[PDB]
Ligand binder design. Structure first.
Ligand SMILES: [Mg+2]
Ligand SMILES: [Mg+2]
Ligand SMILES: [Mg+2]
Ligand SMILES: [Mg+2]
Ligand SMILES: [Mg+2]
Ligand SMILES: [Mg+2]
Ligand SMILES: [Mg+2]
Ligand SMILES: [Mg+2]
Lengths: 152, 146, 129, 82, 205, 123
RNA sequence: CCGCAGAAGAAGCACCGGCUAACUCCGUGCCAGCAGCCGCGGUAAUACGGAGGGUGCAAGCGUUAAUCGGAAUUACUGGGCGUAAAGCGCACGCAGGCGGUUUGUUAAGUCAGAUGUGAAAUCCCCGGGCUCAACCUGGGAACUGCAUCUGAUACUGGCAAG
RNA sequence: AGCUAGUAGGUGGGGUAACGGCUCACCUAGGCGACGAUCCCUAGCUGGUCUGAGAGGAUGACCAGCCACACUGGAACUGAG
């Protein structure tokens, strides 16, 4: 029900005096399908501990979205460290087209139809953060109406 | 001089002598000129006084356009009785492995300048083995994806 | 130097929004007051007032529904270096109808929906959303 | 000379004829001026397959379009004016 | 080129209720069927992505008897048409004449229905056809010619037909070997044992 | 980046050389090997490699690697080159189609018969 | 199309360490050898050769040849110039590009309406016939273009005033 | 980075089925060119085709329209063409 899924796991090194301390880092996302998307990175000495810590971190700091019935109400562009993401409402289209490290996060967010493309360095963590920031910056028509004096 | 640059850069030669070898007319008449491929000849124990192994025959155009002359043909080293059992014992419990080094000529015989080289240890693969283990772990840990 | 008054006005508006300024003042002109009117029709700002006769000064007051600025994005389109003109029905709709692509048409200044309803076109001054 | 004739465009063993106004200096598959319609040889004689424009044919004949044997035969097959 | 060869191994490669052989000879989990227990039995490597989609495409293709190129042509036609690509694809797959015969019961298995269609044991609207790829339109009638009446082939198929449930769009009488196909199915009536949007994602890739 | 600069000099695309210039947009080329020999490889793959220098019909001499274990190739041989480069051999960017008028398949090879010329045996 | 004996007369290719769908054994032992990359192979190779077994397409499978895409890697939509490639050593200035505020007038750029035209063929949509298809064909739209006649004067611009 | 003087134009004749330096005699010394003149290399063009969501990139396989050619080159006649 919590719609949890990780994206990639990578191992790191410390290069200590006695050799190398091989640790592990994770990347997980959590959601339900009506917003409430969270992410977690997670570090540990072992892969299972790292992914558990990533899931626990994703459990908190969960930010909601103002999604339409199955997509966004407007195209959006998200920018981050070295990754740029473009989202288009893409009505019907019997599904998404997004690629790695991005299709996972929206299938977690629950939006079935969306045109998602990534320009720039394809760092999973950076593209996920860019997508989260773009979703946060996205605004709903009801919100903009109440802000601006709808009169529509 | 056919110095065998591999055996020169690794495990310097220590002992050698002079002797010919037996061969047929197909794989001959080009060693008189000098062309050959004797880089790191893998000479191992053979009942016939450690028959020459490893080194192939020169790729000179003496081919009958089917094969060069002999993709794999018997090559015999020459020793009356001095190094069969001793060579077996040295390979077993010393670390010295006899390999062919050069091809000197008495102007008639293509001499097998076999050299008894020391078995040198491999490079520390203790980083790439762990890299491969991490790669297979990454390939296996992709289970929780739907 | 001063190659575009509209771009300067947009930049001053954006800087005031960034700095949380209540009112921004500038020299005034007919095009500037027309853009101010077309923005106030959709209520992107509080109000614009032009004072003075020898040196006409226009001052615009920024709306604030909350801590976040009411206007988030504003971009000049028809810059002096490249003019933009679209057909009757080919005008752009920013954010699928959320925001206004200000357009000066044959009748005058109006928004994208007004231009589509009037069935004409012109130059796209700036996107605001 | 300007004349109305038939051009073949169908696939092998299944021909298809189009009736059209074309100058005789061109070829059968060559250029033309104005299309008049089609006459299917097999004709799939449950549905249509014979559609000519007698008004255009008459207009071009008035200007000097020489009627061809096949065009006259098709006209006699369908009707003089029906 | 209809697929031919082993079927139990083919089914156990995936592990599903795809369908079985018409005859039954101890069809159960005796010792090793699809999830073989005892000293071995690794069934699922659990591939990350696109693997389940490939498996779904393969199981769909082997159930319906269609080849990859024709299946992709059907997918392209479905995407070109309106509605949902998956349901349009399923509609074309069911409109394939062999599946119509199988679901009407004259085909004991889908392979047997294809064999009958090829051997001209089937006719549509009073006309023979020997193409298992023919698409049937709604409000039509498909009959069996008098030659196929005397087939223990067909007798066993019609006997086995009435052990299953019956569809929303087929009404068949065995007193004349004739079936009326009225409407086209939908995802609701179709078995919910596969996902269509994953297949859509795969060939849209 | 300025529009006036673009108008005064349009932004042009960078030419890209083909990895097999000696083919000149042709699937294969025919020549006879001027020499067939063996060449010492690079650092990690010290395994000996077999090459031949062959002068094609276009007047260019190129070096082509020989695949398989055991080669049915020599000098004065009418060969066929298909293209393809090996990163392990320096300055080698061609491959020989074994089984084209002067070459047989790999001896005692029962796999990749299509790729190595041998026909499928009866038994 | 109707009859005739019998399944009787008709399956191969590539791959199986990650990219990508597929695992075990035998032998060689940086040798022989595979490969697009990562990269393998120094006694235990799911990677080499063979064998067994699995996977992907199938009367077609793989290699190679050329274009685009992914390459936002010539980027106008849609890049950057302090340290990764990138601000001329500095200044003047012509052609050139752009241009402060207000009024009137021109209809040039721009916008609207209408006409002719954009050959046919081909893409597409609605249908039809070849056992459905491939293929052919009817109608329609489109071919965003071009020129002409009349209006719009907000903006850029020609002219006259500040 | 300059080219061209039958080359830019005019005055009259001839010539062309018709306009015109197409040509002749004279006069005027201009004409083209930084929006690329002149010169070098390459190239049949278009409807279209492929690849692309798009703008774009490649190309002119089949078919259709047009152009040019018929061993290389030059010239004319017949014929309405
Ligand atoms: Mg692209
Ligand atoms: Mg590009
Ligand atoms: Mg850059
Ligand atoms: Mg620098
Ligand atoms: Mg400086
Ligand atoms: Mg300098
Ligand atoms: Mg004259
Ligand atoms: Mg040419």
């Amino acid at each position: 029900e919590l719609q949890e899924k990780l994206i990639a796991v990578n191992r790191v090194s410390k290069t200590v005096k006695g050799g190398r301390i091989f640790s592990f880092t994770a990347l997980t996302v959590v959601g339900d399908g009506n917003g409430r998307v969270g992410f977690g990175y997670g570090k540990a000495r072992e892969v299972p501990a790292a992914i558990q810590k990533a899931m626990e971190k994703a459990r908190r700091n969960m930010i909601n979205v103002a999604l339409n019935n199955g997509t966004l109400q407007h195209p959006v562009k998200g920018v981050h460290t070295g990754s740029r993401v473009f989202m288009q409402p893409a009505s019907e289209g019997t599904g998404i087209i997004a690629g790695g490290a991005m299709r996972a996060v929206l299938e977690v967010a629950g939006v079935h139809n969306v045109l998602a493309k990534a320009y720039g360095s394809t760092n999973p963590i950076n593209v996920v953060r860019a997508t989260i920031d773009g979703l946060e910056n996205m605004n709903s028509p009801e919100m903009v109406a109440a802000k601006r004096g709808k009169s529509k | 001089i056919a110095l065998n640059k591999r055996a020169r850069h690794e495990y310097f030669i220590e002992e050698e002598f002079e002797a010919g070898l037996a061969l047929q007319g197909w794989e001959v008449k080009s060693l008189r000129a000098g062309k050959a491929n004797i880089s790191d000849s893998y000479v191992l124990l053979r009942d016939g006084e450690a028959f020459l192994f490893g080194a192939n025959i020169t790729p000179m155009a003496v081919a009958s356009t089917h094969v060069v002359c002999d993709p794999t043909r018997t090559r015999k080293l020459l020793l009356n009785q001095r190094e069969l059992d001793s060579l077996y014992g040295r390979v077993n419990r010393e670390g010295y492995t006899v390999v062919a080094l050069s091809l000197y000529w008495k102007n008639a015989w293509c001499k097998v300048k076999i050299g008894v080289a020391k078995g040198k240890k491999q490079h520390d693969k203790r980083s790439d083995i762990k890299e491969r283990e991490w790669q297979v772990d990454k390939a296996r840990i992709m289970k929780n994806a739907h | 130097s001063m190659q575009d008054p509209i771009a300067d006005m947009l930049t001053r508006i954006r800087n005031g929004q960034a700095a949380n300024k209540a009112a921004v003042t500038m020299p005034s002109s007919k095009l500037k007051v027309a853009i101010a009117n077309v923005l106030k029709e959709e209520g992107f700002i509080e109000d614009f007032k032009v004072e003075g006769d020898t040196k006409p000064e226009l001052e615009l007051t920024l709306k604030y529904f909350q801590g976040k600025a009411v206007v988030e994005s504003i971009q000049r389109v028809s810059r002096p270096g490249l003019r933009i003109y679209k057909r009757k029905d080919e005008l752009p709709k920013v954010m699928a109808g959320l925001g206004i692509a200000v357009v000066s048409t044959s009748k005058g200044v109006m928004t994208d929906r007004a231009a589509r309803q009037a069935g004409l076109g012109g130059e796209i001054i700036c996107y605001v959303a | 000379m300007v004349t109305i004739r038939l051009a073949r465009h169908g696939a092998k063993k299944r021909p298809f004829y189009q009736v059209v106004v074309a100058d005789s200096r061109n070829a059968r598959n060559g250029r033309f001026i104005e299309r008049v319609g089609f006459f299917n040889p097999i004709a799939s004689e449950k549905e249509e397959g014979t559609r000519l424009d007698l008004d255009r044919i008459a207009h071009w004949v008035g200007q000097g379009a020489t009627i061809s044997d096949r065009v006259a035969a098709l006209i006699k097959e369908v009707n003089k004016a029906a | 080129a209809r697929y031919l060869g082993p079927k139990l191994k083919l089914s156990r490669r995936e592990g599903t209720d795809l369908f079985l052989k018409s005859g039954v000879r101890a069809i159960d989990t005796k010792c090793k069927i699809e999830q073989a227990p005892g000293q071995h039995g690794a069934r699922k490597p659990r591939l990350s992505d696109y693997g389940v989609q490939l498996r779904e495409k393969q199981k769909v293709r082997r159930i319906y008897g269609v080849l990859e190129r024709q299946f992709r042509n059907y997918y392209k036609e479905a995407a070109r048409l309106k509605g949902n690509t998956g349901e349009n694809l399923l509609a074309l797959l069911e409109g394939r004449l062999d599946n119509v015969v199988y679901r009407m019961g004259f085909g004991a298995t889908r392979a047997e229905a294809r064999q009958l269609v090829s051997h001209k044991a089937i006719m549509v609207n009073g006309r023979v056809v020997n193409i298992a790829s023919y698409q049937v339109s709604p409000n039509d009638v498909v009959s069996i010619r008098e030659k196929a009446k005397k087939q223990s082939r067909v007798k066993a198929a019609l006997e086995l037909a009435e052990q299953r449930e019956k569809p929303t769009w087929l009404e068949v009488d065995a007193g004349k070997m004739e079936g009326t196909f009225k409407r086209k199915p939908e995802r609701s009536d179709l078995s919910a044992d596969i996902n269509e949007h994953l297949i859509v994602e795969l060939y849209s890739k | 980046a300025t529009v006036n600069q673009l108008v005064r000099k349009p932004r042009a695309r960078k030419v890209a050389k083909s990895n097999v210039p000696a083919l000149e947009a042709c699937p294969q080329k025919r020549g006879v090997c001027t020499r067939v020999y063996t060449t010492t490889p690079k650092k990690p793959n010290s395994a000996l490699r077999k090459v031949c220098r062959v002068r094609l019909t276009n007047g260019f001499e190129v070096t082509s690697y020989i695949g398989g274990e055991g080669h049915n190739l020599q000098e004065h041989s009418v060969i066929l080159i298909r293209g393809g480069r090996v990163k392990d051999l320096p300055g080698v960017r061609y491959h020989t189609v074994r089984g084209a008028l002067d070459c047989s398949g790999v001896k005692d090879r029962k796999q990749a018969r299509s790729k190595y010329g041998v026909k499928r045996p009866k038994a």
